[PDB]
Symmetry: D2
Subunit: 295 residues, 4 copies
């Protein structure tokens, strides 16, 4: 037998960093969870028990803390690029590094209408993520994403005109609830290395903001024909507004809310136009995915 | 053997309700998870296999939906009181009802600086809860709470002067990070029944708001001597501002963030006044509880 | 305002211990999660910021490891008694200790029909737990439990003859699936202190085994009239077989499996006697509780 | 913009099936969670709001239940093949179906040394999974796996001789604890269609059993030089024992158990050869992956 592929590293590395503006006394905090996996000429650790080629995963953990101490940790696209470049430049036999970063929200508190200098709240479980693949001789590939963004609209969603056959029991509707957890990923054009990533630093936060704003406004304003059609509208605008993006991917569950017929009880009317009380369903759920690119 | 205590019912009942203002076109949504347990003269279902005394748990589920269709579901203290009173008034052999309600956040979206008429976001995993115990001949006991409120301050927290003996390794500090998940419960004076609960309806949302505001402002502004001392300050103000509350209970984990000594690596300075990168600890955690009442 | 109650300590302390039989080379492992909360004359830490009365929670953590190094950690009723007695004997102003222990399964592997000397498998998520309250001048109160034991029987469960009124839609049945997660707690007679707990050490594992065996055999062999009736049978036998137990408490969800009517599709028969494919329901669920004692 | 890829369907479909041997009265149960995603000529649902090409996800759910009613559901490789073939044969514009199945354990209870006819226990959270991709004109690709298998050995694991540089603090060791959660996947040679899958039905359960046995025996008996080296030994044997497998993939966390130095307390000895009490670490964790194929 032979080794066809192999990677190894450290997962679930939690990191916090604080920035303190000595002048204003204002502090800013960052918290993330980091995963780093390495690839290279490491097959003999598997086949011959030769540990000499292994950078210990404990050392990878150390490296993450040291890099965060000596560099900016925002935007995460920059920090991930710096960290993966380190490993392939530092170790001759390591030729690829895969860095995943999850950013956790710590939003500044407003007290008495004024923003507080050093207190924060986790105002949501929504994440900002990056996946950075650094490959020797092939540059830096970055996928940026937002995940965990949970929304609901109580009207202005429709679903009619779908295929009907002998497996079909679902009724057409012109007014329904639509709720989803948004997972959206934008993939950047390949970058030749760290200098190029640094030259675009301003676009990373602005594009994350645009992606969020467009997702929110399109969900609220689209009189939706389907999940499929609404998500395509989001992806299109984002591509239109940032030319360095090559593809946009959306993955959207359809979290169903079912009507409850109460007519068995004293003729109570709770369906169609009289629907007021609904049963959220934990499972199963629709799952709809799309990758949109340039034509 | 004998039955010394017994209760039974339905848990994890998910409910959504929408309100539609025909005039303005503005819609408002409510989502909760409900648990209802009953007590009464039901021992023979356990000892004699006599199911005649059992209100089926499926029927309890139905009752929750019907009650939500016919009554307001906010504030949750009112809805829980109405639902538990129904069971003890409707069934002669049922003498107590225990109703737990978890309210989930659906916050109105602002689009282009304007509040949207029918789109919402789960802006946090924080919950608003109630526990309502309705007991025949003994009125209605309500405990209201907020839970899941996650906060952090990066400075203005201290912990020195604690007991030191041969089990002690912790060092005193005058500047540390404090992070917690707030669980706060305020217990109302007993109410004689539904009419009295209805007469106080306005105080329920205002007190929840006060409890939140006081928790947030005290956490941000207190130069904290300990978790114990800061939480006592919160409980005291709340009691001072709502006379119908009898006790306030706080339960606060201390989620530790540890310094990381990097001096082994090129003399890097990352402790004490140079501390910038920290390691969040998943476990173990301090747990500190207090119940405060009137003197 | 005044402090009416207060406790504080360390939660989520993970502990592993290994025992090595030098003679046979056989090793045995134990893993648990420990919570210790203290009560006493500690109110001024809350009201006056006096940390002098506080045993730091970090010190409590240390104490747990040291105690495990110097004493047996099985049965958990003994280890919890030893640990809580330490705190009230060691600190004059601490008058109660609350110790919760969760035991995780590490079951010896059988390889080639022979039990392996040092390899283990987590053969289930079922836990063995203890709650030990040690109170100065009032002895040691122990509640032992098993939790997470998940079972299902595909026939020989019934539910008919329950109350029917205008809230009722559930149909009577003489053959249904019954599935639950067992939570069972047996409460021991108060013990005067450590010497008495030690004199009964053999009964702790034997009673846990009995409780398990009786739970399993009664569930499998009872032609169940209801959850209520079957759980009473379990509690009764346990009380009959261990006289040092004062009460037995069971808490049992009814995890529903619903029939699926497929007759809309080519007259397919899948209900009643032809029921073969069912839909497990994640929520809601029945919840049935009973505490049984001696008459 | 253009659609570059798209798939949609139903996730988290829970299914139970019972088999009843009329002759012996013995019953056997199966429970699984199913995900089915479809691909095809469906782009206009995204770009033109044309729902005519959509098979509703509710209909997919129905199809899963009907297929389970009319066919065997074991082994899961067969059931997944049957279900994905249905969709591409039934709908002309659907050209690929992706079926994921998770099998949950329901193990027959032994009562009084005898196997019970209709009672079961979830004896572990370990899963048996399949991923089946059915593609029009390209046959059936099956990946089978076991996941959630949690093990620990308390000795006969080593880790020395790894790379040491200025990022390294980890010490070499010749005796450590090794614990992991096993994720193992074996990929079958492509099959031309259902008849070929049916001709190999006996190999599916036997290979799952072999994969399990080899994983367990190698973990227990290997005096491990590293996670990398031990997992390669497992993959090699499996390939040696089933020629229809093309690749074997392992993904193994290294769940660390750290020594605790207690010497600060009365010279207590708890490290190296005196190590008895350890601290399980929840995070971070090593992550080691390997794909092994034929040479
Ligand atoms: O938006 C929707 N898309 C779908 O594909 C679907 N199928 N069922 N309901 C649905 N709603
Ligand atoms: O606020 C705190 N309270 C405590 O009781 C404690 N113990 N350790 N650290 C602590 N911090
Ligand atoms: O065993 C049962 N007990 C109950 O109380 C019940 N209510 N609905 N179904 C039930 N089954
Ligand atoms: O088995 C191991 N493999 C590794 O790659 C490693 N790195 N640190 N510890 C380790 N143990």
């Amino acid at each position: 037998s032979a080794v066809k592929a192999a990677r190894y590293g450290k997962d679930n590395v939690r990191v916090y960093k604080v920035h303190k503006d000595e002048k204003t006394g204002v502090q800013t905090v960052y918290e993330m969870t980091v995963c780093v996996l390495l690839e290279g000429e490491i097959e003999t650790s598997y086949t011959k028990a030769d540990n000499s080629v292994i950078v210990a995963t404990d050392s990878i953990k150390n490296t993450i803390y040291i890099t965060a101490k000596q560099n900016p940790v925002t935007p995460p696209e920059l920090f991930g690029s710096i960290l993966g470049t380190h490993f392939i430049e530092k170790y001759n036999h390591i030729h690829a590094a895969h860095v995943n970063i999850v950013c956790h929200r710590w939003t500044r508190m407003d007290i008495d209408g004024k923003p507080h200098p050093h207190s924060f709240i986790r105002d949501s479980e929504e994440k900002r993520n990056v996946q950075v693949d650094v490959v020797e001789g092939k540059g830096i590939d970055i996928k940026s994403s937002l995940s965990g963004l949970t929304v609901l609209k109580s009207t202005n969603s429709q679903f009619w005109g779908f295929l009907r056959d002998e497996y079909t029991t679902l009724k057409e509707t012109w007014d329904r609830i639509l709720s989803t957890d948004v997972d959206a990923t934008w993939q950047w054009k390949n970058f030749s290395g760290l200098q190029e990533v640094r030259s675009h630093v301003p676009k990373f936060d602005a594009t994350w903001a645009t992606a969020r704003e467009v997702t929110l406004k399109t969900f609220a304003e689209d009189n939706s024909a389907s999940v499929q059609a609404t998500m395509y509208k989001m992806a299109e605008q984002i591509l239109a507004r940032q030319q360095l993006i090559e593809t946009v991917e959306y993955s959207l569950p359809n979290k169903h809310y079912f009507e409850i017929d109460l007519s068995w009880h004293k003729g109570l009317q709770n369906t169609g136009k009289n629907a007021e009380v609904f049963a959220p369903q934990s499972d199963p759920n629709g799952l709809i995915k799309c990758t949109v690119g340039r034509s």
